[PDB]
Symmetry: C4
Subunit: 309 residues, 4 copies
Amino acid sequence: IQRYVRKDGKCNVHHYRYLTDIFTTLVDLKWRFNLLIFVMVYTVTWLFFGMIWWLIAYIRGCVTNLNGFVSAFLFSIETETTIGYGYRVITDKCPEGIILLLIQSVLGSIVNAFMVGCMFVKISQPKKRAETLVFSTHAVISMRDGKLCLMFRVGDLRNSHIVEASIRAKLIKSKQTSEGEFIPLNQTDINVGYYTGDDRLFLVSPLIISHEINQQSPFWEISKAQLPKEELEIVVILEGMVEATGMTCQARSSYITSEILWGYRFTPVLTLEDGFYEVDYNSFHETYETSTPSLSAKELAELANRAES
Amino acid sequence: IQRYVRKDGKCNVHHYRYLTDIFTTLVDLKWRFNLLIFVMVYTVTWLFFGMIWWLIAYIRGCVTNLNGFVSAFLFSIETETTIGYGYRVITDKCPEGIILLLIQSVLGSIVNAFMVGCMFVKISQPKKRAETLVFSTHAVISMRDGKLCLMFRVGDLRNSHIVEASIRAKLIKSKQTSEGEFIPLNQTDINVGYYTGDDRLFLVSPLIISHEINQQSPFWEISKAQLPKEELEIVVILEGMVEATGMTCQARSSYITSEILWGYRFTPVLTLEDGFYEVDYNSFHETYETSTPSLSAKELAELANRAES
Amino acid sequence: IQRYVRKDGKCNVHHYRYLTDIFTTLVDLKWRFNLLIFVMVYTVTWLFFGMIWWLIAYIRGCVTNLNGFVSAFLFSIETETTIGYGYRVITDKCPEGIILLLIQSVLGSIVNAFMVGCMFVKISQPKKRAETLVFSTHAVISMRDGKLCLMFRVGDLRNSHIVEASIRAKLIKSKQTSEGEFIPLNQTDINVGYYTGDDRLFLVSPLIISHEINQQSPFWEISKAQLPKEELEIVVILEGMVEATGMTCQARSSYITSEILWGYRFTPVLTLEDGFYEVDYNSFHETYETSTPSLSAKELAELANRAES
Amino acid sequence: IQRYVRKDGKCNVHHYRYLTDIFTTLVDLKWRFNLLIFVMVYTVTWLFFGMIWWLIAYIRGCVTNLNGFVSAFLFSIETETTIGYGYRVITDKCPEGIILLLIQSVLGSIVNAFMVGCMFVKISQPKKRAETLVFSTHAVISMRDGKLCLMFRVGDLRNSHIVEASIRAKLIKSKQTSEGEFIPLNQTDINVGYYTGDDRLFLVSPLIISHEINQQSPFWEISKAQLPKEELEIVVILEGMVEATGMTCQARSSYITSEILWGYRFTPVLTLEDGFYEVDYNSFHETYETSTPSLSAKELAELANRAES
Ligand SMILES: [K+]
Ligand SMILES: [K+]
Ligand SMILES: [K+]
Ligand SMILES: [K+]
Ligand SMILES: [K+]
Ligand SMILES: [K+]
Ligand SMILES: [K+]
Ligand SMILES: [K+]
Ligand SMILES: [K+]
Ligand code: NA
Ligand code: NA
Ligand code: NA
Ligand code: NA
């Protein structure tokens, strides 16, 4: 079976009521098509309202300097964008011209919001910030202060902060309930600091998120030997708010069984440079191995308890 | 008694200070009326300010090419939408014309914001996204890995993510305090992962939310037999943020006693298709039954503890 | 001593760097003054930029149909609001006119945002929604299912929802540390459901928030007799998001010692009406008394434990 | 080694994909340059689109009153800002003029959003509010009601509220894992009320945030003597939402070993003035010393337990 989440964040999942928020799907399209729809909508409302200026003018003979279809188009433009050159002016003759100018000039603002606000949000969409949030390429398992840990690194490239930033992790692997039920990609949260508000990040320079492999960890019975045998995947999620706006964003990444390295450890990145801190981003992803017992956390702890003198 | 929340989310509840935020009620109205008010406000400010252009012009004889009421209307329009055709131009004569152009042109922007921003928010309201978030039609109770569970499925139809997404559930049923007090629709939260951040969803492909029926569960003493006898309703709430904007949204649904099925289980939806995952949305709501003890979780556990060999 | 928070929410507290976000203070002013500043800023930029059109025209003799100060003002207006009547047109003569039109037309949009966006936010400020969120006028203490409770009611008048809505309460009273230190208005949080996500509200029809008076409660040793002797105040806070926008809001209220009624209980508000629920908002604030022991929760529990047969 | 966070909040840290959200970096620049780019973009699109009006007019001989380059520039301006003086008018001759007016007038709104919305956000950026949130200049350690506490004061200068406001603290100091691994600026959260929702602030008048120095505190074994020997730094973070908008903000500050005062205590700031509370902001930062044991919290508690009579 192939992975559920790519290293960059896109999922490998494929899926009537999409027109209950035509706006939500409007902001998704790539620029070129957004810029085309924007044109379409604008031109066709210049068409429709321009066609009604030609319908009432046909019954009258309100209108100054209008001739064919090529001229009735240029009046609807001077009105909706409120250009109004002054070559094509309006007069007092018909009642059907006064009330339709109102309808056009008002509905010109409604078309303005739907599009300008639309154009705003996509320029200002937060998913972009998540580009400059980065995860180590592998995760490691090595010892820390006595206890075995699953560790991955997290970084923020942009100098700006990410407010109320947090990290959570979900372990994904199929399982079978003792009752028979097979559950395809069963998600189960991994502890990465949630019981101590240690999962609340002060992300400035790159941090190593550590999940300790205790009794309640999924990695409790995985040993160095069993690890490559397993068929699991660790989804890593980082959420928080772009300091510069009120936008909330999410950056994701994944670790499949083969990308977790047993016995390794992260290369430091920090150096103090004459009154500032220098983050050597070259050593970010890089790791190195150190002496690391090959036993499962469950056994390590069992032998450590049997060592009571 | 009838239900508190409909399967789609609307509540069956009916309720001076509504004019302390005339804006909040302005965004509620259906489009046609919003589009009418928009017209009203725009036309009547063209009226008022146009009427004051006719009042000061009456005392003067500032004004170029103005005649009756049908012409004074077309000047206020060329000014507030800043059309300004150049047929009706302003001159240097009266002081009461210079300062009133300022008042109109400035208050033309104030009317613009109140309406354009108004038009923005409703196009961009989040309640819409909640349309494409969906709940299984029934909930089930069956065994999982030894312990009895109340389970309902949750789905997101749109390919876009829902950031910081979470699920919570409230059990609604009237009760009487031993002291006598009757409480009409007393709400009491149901555990659906809150003590482990398992209620924090990574909602991509459809998930089964499971509430285990332990000592602290309301369903602790409900057996298969008692269930249809009960008069309870489970409100299911899903909250989180639209990836595409900073909007927070809520999707709700309900389970009344008869819609909870004892002994059943959800049909899988996942299939791996040549390097992506295929979610067969047809089996979403569908369930099937399996061997499931008819005893209450309280008794099941009591007999399992008595089985100690 | 007088109270810290009024029944409506304003605090009784009085307090250089206020110009580090001149915007934040700009949205605070009442409408009339906001509407005046808006005028000021607009007129004075029409003045400044209009004065520079008169400075370069003085060195030239770029300019069509301009005379005195009363005419140079009407050109700056036709340019910044992009009215441009066509009576006062621009020509090719001087270089100092071409680049200044650019500077004005660009800085006309900068003045537009600062003001239009300003005008948007205040119309769309959330503090308003908090008007239609309401708290019972008194709080009560009576028994519930064996244990003594401090209870106040909460309501939402508007039919719209309040997403991710929550309630928290802080007990305010001065205290002296055994070491001598006197602390003026020491705040200490009261449990109103925080350890069970029962403080997470599904606020539709009016809810009674209950704080049980256990060992950890401040009201643990307050008896009916001692209550009127105490000098405490309960601040009640409700926070959450306006369904209609991404705004987060806060509604506050207070209970001073005299407004907490010992031995009373809230009048029900619910009635089921032919397929909807009718909330009789008249009985909202209203209470009534019932048999309620006059002893402190600490003693009640002590005697209940001594009753072990 | 020098500190990680300055007393005002800037960090002493220095750090391709920055063009995946050119918008995010657009809002960062200081005003003068923002105002220059705004000019650049506007002028160069007036250039490009103006140059295409000169290209199609060259193949024709659509155009009224156009001559050299100095005149073709003034047409593109009357069109994109929708000024349209009426001296330079459009006619029916060529098809390449009609469709290009559409392209310009539409892309004039796209350039409008990107810039006006840009201009909006920076005026409305939240980081500013964090200016008027303030931290005591030192932190103290003294006794409170028996137990030793690390205390710093927090204030909000602006009369407006900060919704859903919270305080958290991270202790920063390098450490070595018993396994050998040296960790440069290892962060570890300090308890400031997180297990009781006491870290949820009702920040109106200035509050003393207290971290009790218990077994789980980092300051458990630091005595008065050892404190000046240590090389630690306490980062203090305050997060929450600007009442006036939906913006979330963060105010930070730091305490290095030398700024924590052992044996001192904060000067009160509150006085009740004729029906309001007067906060004497002069005594905000100020402290004073009182009798305070010089032993480490670990020992204090050890001797208090040995005192059992
Ligand atoms: K215009
Ligand atoms: K115009
Ligand atoms: K014009
Ligand atoms: K917690
Ligand atoms: K928790
Ligand atoms: K927001
Ligand atoms: K004109
Ligand atoms: K919790
Ligand atoms: K908690
Ligand atoms: Na950063
Ligand atoms: Na999704
Ligand atoms: Na409601
Ligand atoms: Na305040």
